[PDB]
Amino acid sequence: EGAFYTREYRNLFKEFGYSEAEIQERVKDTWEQLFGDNPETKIYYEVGDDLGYLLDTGNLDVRTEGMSYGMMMAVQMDRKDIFDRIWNWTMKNMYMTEGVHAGYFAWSCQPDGTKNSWGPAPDGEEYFALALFFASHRWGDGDEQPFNYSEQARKLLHTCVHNGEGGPGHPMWNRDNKLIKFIPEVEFSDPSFHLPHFYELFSLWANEEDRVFWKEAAEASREYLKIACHPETGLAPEYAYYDGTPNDEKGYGHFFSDSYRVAANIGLDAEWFGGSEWSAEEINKIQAFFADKEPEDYRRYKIDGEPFEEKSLHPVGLIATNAMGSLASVDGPYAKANVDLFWNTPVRTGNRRYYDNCLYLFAMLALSGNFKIWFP
Ligand code: NI
């Protein structure tokens, strides 16, 4: 039974023999390396007295993925000051009032706030919504907008489901199949965006008129992951059609950066809402695939396991997500090995570090029992 029911979160590091003190230290140190003054590893930058952002170090921009991740990290760490700085910057610079995506958040901005695009990234929106619910529950809704967290969360999820009913916009979920879309204007998806564990919570906290929908989306996403992951290797493509097969029209049909999050998502869903045979078997497959592979040699792979020459651009993120996956297969043959590999992998330095380090902190939180559901 999941932590949603028991209200107790598995500390997998502790169960695998790491000491409580060393785990506490490592979690704090990971946070400080990302959010404190550690220039080589840092991803969060403060602006003035009321603003802040996470920088995609590779692309030298600010992404809704990173901002929404940062808000989730901040609420898990009980840091309202950081949460509010990030959410303030997001609302000021990213929220769109004009164009076909009005009501959504521009996916990429320059550090000065300028929008690079008026298109959104749905995985940002879903993280914003849950982070905002958790903020409301930990701290209470603020008296002034946009710090009225729960109202902001319900409003955003309203748009995600209903956009286009009274305008030229489009929803972020397909209403017939209940699957999240890659972007609002296409009819394909991205397995790593599927967060059934988030949708379960939306089914409790969203506008009542959408609560049944969110339950259906949770179930649809769970079923979709079964068809999207390769049956032998467990590997999921970055983009996939609704039929589950890879969309490689632009090179996103393989196991690469986006895909890494699938194992992590499966880990967190198992922890929050309970284990399943499918999830344990899926994590065992991914871990088996990587069991004889050295991180320095990690590649892009076809989902059937065939390697490309191209190296993984985010091998530390891959390590972190595979370790986080162990939450879904705690007795798996490679579960301990993956957790140990992650323990022995430092936070990333250099220009590609942002993505790796986001995945790293999520795994540190989840594996230590600190990635929690915050209830009203
Ligand atoms: Ni120590």
Side-chain angles (χ1 to χ4, degrees):
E1 48 174 337
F4 173 89
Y5 308 98
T6 65
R7 311 300 181 85
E8 298 190 342
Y9 296 81
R10 187 186 306 273
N11 185 342
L12 194 53
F13 286 133
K14 188 184 182 300
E15 292 186 358
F16 285 168
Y18 293 93
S19 77
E20 64 172 305
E22 291 302 303
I23 296 161
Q24 179 187 0
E25 183 181 20
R26 188 62 175 281
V27 173
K28 179 173 174 163
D29 289 357
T30 303
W31 166 266
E32 287 301 328
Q33 282 202 76
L34 274 48
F35 285 80
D37 192 68
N38 287 281
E40 289 290 319
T41 47
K42 184 198 209 193
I43 62 177
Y44 166 78
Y45 299 86
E46 227 154 59
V47 187
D49 277 40
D50 68 350
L51 294 168
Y53 59 85
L54 276 73
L55 182 77
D56 181 331
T57 54
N59 298 294
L60 298 180
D61 63 359
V62 179
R63 296 175 174 210
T64 53
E65 274 189 347
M67 299 296 266
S68 70
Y69 284 171
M71 285 161 61
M72 184 61 79
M73 293 158 182
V75 70
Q76 294 297 338
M77 293 294 297
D78 199 18
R79 289 292 299 278
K80 183 180 190 301
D81 60 321
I82 292 173
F83 187 99
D84 288 346
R85 283 174 175 276
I86 295 166
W87 179 233
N88 196 26
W89 199 102
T90 299
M91 281 300 302
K92 185 174 304 283
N93 298 129
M94 314 187 97
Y95 183 72
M96 292 181 284
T97 54
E98 300 159 332
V100 78
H101 299 119
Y104 295 135
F105 297 83
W107 81 274
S108 171
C109 290
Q110 290 300 94
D112 69 8
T114 309
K115 295 177 181 65
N116 290 320
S117 178
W118 281 20
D123 59 324
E125 269 71 1
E126 58 186 345
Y127 267 84
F128 286 135
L130 192 61
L132 288 162
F133 282 129
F134 286 170
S136 177
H137 303 163
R138 295 204 78 166
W139 305 318
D141 274 13
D143 290 338
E144 79 179 62
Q145 299 184 21
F147 308 103
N148 52 327
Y149 307 120
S150 70
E151 284 178 287
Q152 294 288 340
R154 290 192 301 269
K155 175 201 282 278
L156 179 59
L157 292 179
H158 168 81
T159 307
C160 292
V161 174
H162 293 274
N163 207 207
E165 281 166 13
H170 293 123
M172 281 183 169
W173 274 254
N174 177 289
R175 289 283 290 280
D176 295 324
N177 66 28
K178 298 101 180 79
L179 300 173
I180 194 175
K181 301 174 185 180
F182 169 64
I183 55 178
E185 57 267 70
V186 304
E187 290 292 351
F188 66 87
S189 195
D190 179 316
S192 77
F193 287 14
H194 290 257
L195 307 176
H197 51 305
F198 284 37
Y199 317 148
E200 298 277 14
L201 299 171
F202 297 166
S203 85
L204 302 175
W205 304 331
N207 288 338
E208 283 192 75
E209 67 173 5
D210 297 338
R211 287 180 188 179
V212 166
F213 171 87
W214 286 115
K215 182 178 172 180
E216 294 167 343
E219 176 64 16
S221 283
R222 292 199 174 97
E223 289 304 317
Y224 184 67
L225 286 177
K226 300 184 171 185
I227 64 169
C229 297
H230 191 273
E232 304 304 310
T233 64
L235 306 176
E238 294 184 287
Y239 303 173
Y241 298 115
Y242 295 145
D243 67 28
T245 66
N247 171 0
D248 200 36
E249 292 170 27
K250 296 294 161 191
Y252 294 88
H254 312 299
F255 186 77
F256 210 57
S257 306
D258 281 28
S259 311
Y260 302 166
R261 299 169 297 196
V262 172
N265 293 339
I266 293 171
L268 194 59
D269 186 30
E271 181 52 27
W272 284 5
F273 287 99
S276 68
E277 310 195 84
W278 184 90
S279 293
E281 289 164 343
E282 161 63 20
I283 295 311
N284 291 344
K285 292 172 197 188
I286 298 175
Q287 291 185 349
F289 181 78
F290 286 104
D292 65 338
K293 293 178 177 62
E294 292 298 327
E296 313 93 277
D297 186 58
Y298 288 168
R299 310 294 180 84
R300 184 188 301 269
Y301 307 90
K302 291 187 172 170
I303 61 163
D304 73 354
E306 190 180 317
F308 288 80
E309 289 175 30
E310 185 181 13
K311 300 280 193 70
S312 177
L313 284 173
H314 301 289
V316 171
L318 180 46
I319 290 171
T321 58
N322 281 348
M324 185 163 160
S326 296
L327 289 164
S329 193
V330 304
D331 295 304
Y334 317 96
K336 173 98 153 46
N338 274 265
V339 170
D340 289 339
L341 178 60
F342 179 49
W343 190 271
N344 290 107
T345 301
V347 171
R348 206 173 198 197
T349 59
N351 298 338
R352 291 174 200 161
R353 77 184 174 275
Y354 150 82
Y355 187 65
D356 301 82
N357 291 354
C358 287
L359 279 36
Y360 196 115
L361 180 55
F362 283 140
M364 276 291 170
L365 292 172
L367 291 165
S368 63
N370 285 298
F371 202 150
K372 300 185 180 180
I373 303 169
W374 297 96
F375 289 92

PDB file of all heavy atoms in Angstrom, residues 70-86:
ATOM      1  N   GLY A  70      11.601  23.582  -9.943  1.00  0.00           N
ATOM      2  CA  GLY A  70      12.133  24.382  -8.832  1.00  0.00           C
ATOM      3  C   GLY A  70      11.082  24.652  -7.766  1.00  0.00           C
ATOM      4  O   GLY A  70      11.369  24.585  -6.573  1.00  0.00           O
ATOM      5  N   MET A  71       9.856  24.947  -8.194  1.00  0.00           N
ATOM      6  CA  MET A  71       8.757  25.127  -7.251  1.00  0.00           C
ATOM      7  C   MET A  71       8.473  23.825  -6.499  1.00  0.00           C
ATOM      8  O   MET A  71       8.300  23.834  -5.276  1.00  0.00           O
ATOM      9  CB  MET A  71       7.500  25.651  -7.955  1.00  0.00           C
ATOM     10  CG  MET A  71       7.592  27.120  -8.310  1.00  0.00           C
ATOM     11  SD  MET A  71       6.406  27.627  -9.576  1.00  0.00           S
ATOM     12  CE  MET A  71       4.852  27.242  -8.769  1.00  0.00           C
ATOM     13  N   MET A  72       8.437  22.695  -7.216  1.00  0.00           N
ATOM     14  CA  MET A  72       8.244  21.406  -6.550  1.00  0.00           C
ATOM     15  C   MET A  72       9.356  21.126  -5.536  1.00  0.00           C
ATOM     16  O   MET A  72       9.084  20.694  -4.409  1.00  0.00           O
ATOM     17  CB  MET A  72       8.118  20.231  -7.545  1.00  0.00           C
ATOM     18  CG  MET A  72       7.830  18.885  -6.870  1.00  0.00           C
ATOM     19  SD  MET A  72       6.277  18.886  -5.955  1.00  0.00           S
ATOM     20  CE  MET A  72       5.104  18.662  -7.307  1.00  0.00           C
ATOM     21  N   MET A  73      10.603  21.372  -5.931  1.00  0.00           N
ATOM     22  CA  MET A  73      11.731  21.178  -5.014  1.00  0.00           C
ATOM     23  C   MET A  73      11.584  22.072  -3.783  1.00  0.00           C
ATOM     24  O   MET A  73      11.765  21.615  -2.648  1.00  0.00           O
ATOM     25  CB  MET A  73      13.049  21.463  -5.725  1.00  0.00           C
ATOM     26  CG  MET A  73      13.387  20.471  -6.831  1.00  0.00           C
ATOM     27  SD  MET A  73      14.556  21.228  -7.983  1.00  0.00           S
ATOM     28  CE  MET A  73      14.708  19.879  -9.158  1.00  0.00           C
ATOM     29  N   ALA A  74      11.245  23.339  -4.014  1.00  0.00           N
ATOM     30  CA  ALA A  74      11.142  24.306  -2.912  1.00  0.00           C
ATOM     31  C   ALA A  74      10.044  23.931  -1.919  1.00  0.00           C
ATOM     32  O   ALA A  74      10.240  24.025  -0.699  1.00  0.00           O
ATOM     33  CB  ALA A  74      10.939  25.706  -3.439  1.00  0.00           C
ATOM     34  N   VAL A  75       8.881  23.504  -2.411  1.00  0.00           N
ATOM     35  CA  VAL A  75       7.808  23.132  -1.478  1.00  0.00           C
ATOM     36  C   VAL A  75       8.166  21.861  -0.714  1.00  0.00           C
ATOM     37  O   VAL A  75       7.852  21.733   0.473  1.00  0.00           O
ATOM     38  CB  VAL A  75       6.393  23.072  -2.142  1.00  0.00           C
ATOM     39  CG1 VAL A  75       6.255  21.901  -3.111  1.00  0.00           C
ATOM     40  CG2 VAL A  75       5.301  23.016  -1.082  1.00  0.00           C
ATOM     41  N   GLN A  76       8.843  20.916  -1.370  1.00  0.00           N
ATOM     42  CA  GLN A  76       9.283  19.718  -0.658  1.00  0.00           C
ATOM     43  C   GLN A  76      10.280  20.066   0.456  1.00  0.00           C
ATOM     44  O   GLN A  76      10.309  19.412   1.508  1.00  0.00           O
ATOM     45  CB  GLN A  76       9.892  18.688  -1.619  1.00  0.00           C
ATOM     46  CG  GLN A  76       8.888  18.102  -2.615  1.00  0.00           C
ATOM     47  CD  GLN A  76       7.772  17.317  -1.945  1.00  0.00           C
ATOM     48  OE1 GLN A  76       7.910  16.845  -0.805  1.00  0.00           O
ATOM     49  NE2 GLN A  76       6.660  17.154  -2.657  1.00  0.00           N
ATOM     50  N   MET A  77      11.072  21.107   0.219  1.00  0.00           N
ATOM     51  CA  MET A  77      12.108  21.531   1.169  1.00  0.00           C
ATOM     52  C   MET A  77      11.616  22.581   2.164  1.00  0.00           C
ATOM     53  O   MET A  77      12.405  23.089   2.968  1.00  0.00           O
ATOM     54  CB  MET A  77      13.347  22.044   0.420  1.00  0.00           C
ATOM     55  CG  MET A  77      14.079  20.960  -0.367  1.00  0.00           C
ATOM     56  SD  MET A  77      14.832  19.678   0.652  1.00  0.00           S
ATOM     57  CE  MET A  77      16.035  20.637   1.573  1.00  0.00           C
ATOM     58  N   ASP A  78      10.325  22.892   2.130  1.00  0.00           N
ATOM     59  CA  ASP A  78       9.736  23.914   2.992  1.00  0.00           C
ATOM     60  C   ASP A  78      10.441  25.251   2.831  1.00  0.00           C
ATOM     61  O   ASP A  78      10.773  25.899   3.783  1.00  0.00           O
ATOM     62  CB  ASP A  78       9.730  23.443   4.452  1.00  0.00           C
ATOM     63  CG  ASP A  78       8.752  24.204   5.317  1.00  0.00           C
ATOM     64  OD1 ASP A  78       7.859  24.843   4.809  1.00  0.00           O
ATOM     65  OD2 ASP A  78       8.953  24.116   6.529  1.00  0.00           O
ATOM     66  N   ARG A  79      10.613  25.692   1.606  1.00  0.00           N
ATOM     67  CA  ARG A  79      11.256  26.974   1.319  1.00  0.00           C
ATOM     68  C   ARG A  79      10.323  27.844   0.486  1.00  0.00           C
ATOM     69  O   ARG A  79      10.455  27.978  -0.687  1.00  0.00           O
ATOM     70  CB  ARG A  79      12.599  26.783   0.634  1.00  0.00           C
ATOM     71  CG  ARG A  79      13.674  26.225   1.554  1.00  0.00           C
ATOM     72  CD  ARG A  79      14.095  27.246   2.665  1.00  0.00           C
ATOM     73  NE  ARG A  79      14.639  28.464   2.139  1.00  0.00           N
ATOM     74  CZ  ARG A  79      15.883  28.622   1.750  1.00  0.00           C
ATOM     75  NH1 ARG A  79      16.738  27.636   1.885  1.00  0.00           N
ATOM     76  NH2 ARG A  79      16.274  29.759   1.272  1.00  0.00           N
ATOM     77  N   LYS A  80       9.412  28.467   1.206  1.00  0.00           N
ATOM     78  CA  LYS A  80       8.406  29.375   0.622  1.00  0.00           C
ATOM     79  C   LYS A  80       9.043  30.591  -0.025  1.00  0.00           C
ATOM     80  O   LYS A  80       8.590  31.066  -1.000  1.00  0.00           O
ATOM     81  CB  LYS A  80       7.375  29.769   1.684  1.00  0.00           C
ATOM     82  CG  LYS A  80       6.231  30.651   1.162  1.00  0.00           C
ATOM     83  CD  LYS A  80       5.282  30.961   2.304  1.00  0.00           C
ATOM     84  CE  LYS A  80       4.012  31.607   1.847  1.00  0.00           C
ATOM     85  NZ  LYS A  80       4.220  32.827   1.155  1.00  0.00           N
ATOM     86  N   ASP A  81      10.115  31.083   0.584  1.00  0.00           N
ATOM     87  CA  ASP A  81      10.832  32.214   0.008  1.00  0.00           C
ATOM     88  C   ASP A  81      11.290  31.928  -1.433  1.00  0.00           C
ATOM     89  O   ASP A  81      11.119  32.753  -2.331  1.00  0.00           O
ATOM     90  CB  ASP A  81      12.016  32.635   0.902  1.00  0.00           C
ATOM     91  CG  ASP A  81      13.044  31.528   1.098  1.00  0.00           C
ATOM     92  OD1 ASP A  81      12.666  30.346   1.245  1.00  0.00           O
ATOM     93  OD2 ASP A  81      14.251  31.851   1.128  1.00  0.00           O
ATOM     94  N   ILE A  82      11.858  30.743  -1.644  1.00  0.00           N
ATOM     95  CA  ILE A  82      12.333  30.344  -2.969  1.00  0.00           C
ATOM     96  C   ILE A  82      11.152  30.030  -3.889  1.00  0.00           C
ATOM     97  O   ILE A  82      11.122  30.492  -5.027  1.00  0.00           O
ATOM     98  CB  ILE A  82      13.334  29.167  -2.863  1.00  0.00           C
ATOM     99  CG1 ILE A  82      14.623  29.669  -2.182  1.00  0.00           C
ATOM    100  CG2 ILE A  82      13.654  28.568  -4.228  1.00  0.00           C
ATOM    101  CD1 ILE A  82      15.622  28.609  -1.863  1.00  0.00           C
ATOM    102  N   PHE A  83      10.183  29.285  -3.370  1.00  0.00           N
ATOM    103  CA  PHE A  83       8.964  28.984  -4.115  1.00  0.00           C
ATOM    104  C   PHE A  83       8.354  30.260  -4.693  1.00  0.00           C
ATOM    105  O   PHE A  83       8.086  30.347  -5.889  1.00  0.00           O
ATOM    106  CB  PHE A  83       7.957  28.300  -3.205  1.00  0.00           C
ATOM    107  CG  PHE A  83       6.748  27.796  -3.922  1.00  0.00           C
ATOM    108  CD1 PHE A  83       6.654  26.450  -4.268  1.00  0.00           C
ATOM    109  CD2 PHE A  83       5.710  28.661  -4.267  1.00  0.00           C
ATOM    110  CE1 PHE A  83       5.536  25.957  -4.933  1.00  0.00           C
ATOM    111  CE2 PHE A  83       4.578  28.175  -4.938  1.00  0.00           C
ATOM    112  CZ  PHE A  83       4.496  26.824  -5.272  1.00  0.00           C
ATOM    113  N   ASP A  84       8.150  31.255  -3.832  1.00  0.00           N
ATOM    114  CA  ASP A  84       7.507  32.503  -4.251  1.00  0.00           C
ATOM    115  C   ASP A  84       8.334  33.313  -5.249  1.00  0.00           C
ATOM    116  O   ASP A  84       7.789  33.899  -6.186  1.00  0.00           O
ATOM    117  CB  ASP A  84       7.149  33.358  -3.029  1.00  0.00           C
ATOM    118  CG  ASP A  84       5.986  32.796  -2.236  1.00  0.00           C
ATOM    119  OD1 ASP A  84       5.259  31.900  -2.739  1.00  0.00           O
ATOM    120  OD2 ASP A  84       5.776  33.257  -1.090  1.00  0.00           O
ATOM    121  N   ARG A  85       9.650  33.356  -5.054  1.00  0.00           N
ATOM    122  CA  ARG A  85      10.527  34.001  -6.025  1.00  0.00           C
ATOM    123  C   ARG A  85      10.363  33.391  -7.425  1.00  0.00           C
ATOM    124  O   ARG A  85      10.231  34.117  -8.410  1.00  0.00           O
ATOM    125  CB  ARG A  85      11.992  33.927  -5.574  1.00  0.00           C
ATOM    126  CG  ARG A  85      12.352  34.914  -4.471  1.00  0.00           C
ATOM    127  CD  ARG A  85      13.775  34.654  -3.999  1.00  0.00           C
ATOM    128  NE  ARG A  85      14.285  35.620  -3.019  1.00  0.00           N
ATOM    129  CZ  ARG A  85      14.835  36.796  -3.320  1.00  0.00           C
ATOM    130  NH1 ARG A  85      14.934  37.210  -4.583  1.00  0.00           N
ATOM    131  NH2 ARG A  85      15.286  37.571  -2.341  1.00  0.00           N
ATOM    132  N   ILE A  86      10.373  32.061  -7.497  1.00  0.00           N
ATOM    133  CA  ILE A  86      10.253  31.361  -8.776  1.00  0.00           C
ATOM    134  C   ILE A  86       8.862  31.548  -9.394  1.00  0.00           C
ATOM    135  O   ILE A  86       8.742  31.877 -10.583  1.00  0.00           O
ATOM    136  CB  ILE A  86      10.556  29.866  -8.601  1.00  0.00           C
ATOM    137  CG1 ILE A  86      12.021  29.653  -8.202  1.00  0.00           C
ATOM    138  CG2 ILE A  86      10.234  29.096  -9.872  1.00  0.00           C
ATOM    139  CD1 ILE A  86      12.300  28.251  -7.700  1.00  0.00           C
TER     140      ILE A  86
END
